[PDB]
């Protein structure tokens with residue numbers, strides 16, 4: 054092979070598991086030895102293209118915050134709370150709307166004080182529910198609001214005891230835009246195990262945090278690559294609410310190439 | 312192949328990086344082609360002994376808490392505070408000691424309010440610090456206490472700035488016993504780096520969190536293999552102070568080989 058050695062390093066520099074890494078080159082060389090002619094230059098673009106088609110239809114990416122309720126659940130320490138912040142500061146100080154807050158984060162000591170004083174800065178309300186009875190109660194209390202940002206308890210979502218618990222408190226229906234927050238820092242094998250666990254709970258988009266601490270993004274590719282949905286936002290720093298962006302398939306696939 | 316193919320299978324299962332398996336096998340295959348009888352029954356013995364002889368010696372592991380000042384720094388959301396927390400209750404409640412607290416986490420919003428309303432529970436003193444002088448003072452104020460648990464801000468240590476702010480704010484002398492906090496969920500490649508950026512600052516042990524949340528421990532081995540210090544602590548849940556533990560080189564390996 055020739056300009057392929059060049060592309061074999063690319064797929065290697067990225068995360069991308071083996072199954073894929075190898076399968077991509079298969080696809081490249083096939084539709085290449087028959088299609089046109091590869092250059093030392095156009096290898097990547099052709100490379101990026103093929104990859105991009107392994108993800109979900111680009112329409113499944115960049116779904117804006119539309120529905121009323123905006124919930125966020127995920128791994129412990131990835132960016133759940135600090136993100137709702139970044140989002141809220143947008144749905145108010147930018148798209149000018151009636152903003153509210155609700156939290157399910159009980160389990161941890163003084164865990165609430167955080168968002169508690171996060172709202173105190175956005176002059177928005179806040180409710181803390183320990184039972185769905187209270188959560189729905191909370192939904193009425195904000196009825197007149199455009200967007201109600203929900204927060205959740207950080208939990209090791211492997212043990213099933215916790216996906217039940219989540220579906221217990223929150224209802225999940227018509228007016229809810231769920232988001233699964235994951236850190237681009239997590240190992241693929243890990244993420245894949247929990248993603249399968251949220252199979253029993255609806256989810257609109259992906260939120261991958263800490264892309265700036267990452268070293269590669271292939272671990273993120275593999276997750277999306279084998280999923281129905283794409284990614285909503287992607288935090289990229291601590292600074293609130295600046296450090297946070299949004300991306301599209303090919304655009305992502307473009308950060309991916311190490 | 313032979314009873315060795317088995318060892319070939321175990322290695323696969325662990326997150327161990329290729330080069331290491333290749334080498335563990337050359338060792339295994341060597342000291343068995345001119346040695347004992349790798350009964351597929353006692354093959355798992357040497358495969359661990361070999362691996363074990365690759366991490367720093369037992370003496371570099373399990374360094375108990377002695378110094379008057381205990382410092383924990385590390386990746387974002389890894390589990391520094393909950394850990395600094397588990398570590399404090401244990402020293403107090405179980406080892407009967409005069410505990411004290413100190414924070415440097417001025418960055419994270421509400422970070423203080425929580426550690427304070429927690430230190431209050433453990434009924435212990437806490438002093439916030441924005442400068443090196445302030446810290447040194449508190450560090451000198453608590454001079455009468457046995458142990459002083461210092462918590463730090465979770466900045467992304469890829470910007471040498473913060474690795475400097477750390478050494479600046481926190482001096483580092485005989486009195487201190489620092490602990491680098493990394494999570495068992497991170498990819499090896501990410502840790503491979505962030506461990507170099509910390510070369511300047513001295514580190515006594517290592518704290519790997521969320522072992523109850525990861526799938527394999529290969530990455531944690533990979534990091535240790537090419538290190539000069541072992542692990543002090545490991546955490547396995549969110550319950551304080553229960554979910555915390557200690558391991559030995561051979562003990563850690565027994566966790567890799569399932």
Ligand SMILES: Nc1nc2c(ncn2[C@@H]2O[C@H](COP(=O)(O)OP(=O)(O)NP(=O)(O)O)[C@@H](O)[C@H]2O)c(=O)[nH]1
Nearest residue numbers: 130131132133134135207263288289290291387465
């Ligand atoms: N570099 C970086 N750090 C981030 C990003 N998002 C969150 N962090 C950091 O990760 C840490 C934890 O964030 P936080 O929002 O509290 O996480 P969480 O998911 O709510 N934690 P929990 O599940 O415990 O409630 C903070 O120190 C924060 O600065 C990001 O995009 N980049």
Ligand SMILES: Nc1nc2c(ncn2[C@@H]2O[C@H](COP(=O)(O)OP(=O)(O)NP(=O)(O)O)[C@@H](O)[C@H]2O)c(=O)[nH]1
Nearest residue numbers: 129130207388389390391392393465521546547548
């Ligand atoms: N499953 C599990 N979760 C853990 C463990 N240690 C910490 N966590 C979780 O990880 C999250 C972050 O913990 P925290 O103490 O805020 O981490 P930190 O390093 O102080 N965060 P920051 O750098 O943002 O200040 C919490 O949701 C906590 O429950 C552990 O051993 N197992």
Ligand SMILES: [Mg+2]
Nearest residue numbers: 133134135207
């Ligand atoms: Mg949170």
Ligand SMILES: [Mg+2]
Nearest residue numbers: 391392416465
């Ligand atoms: Mg903390």
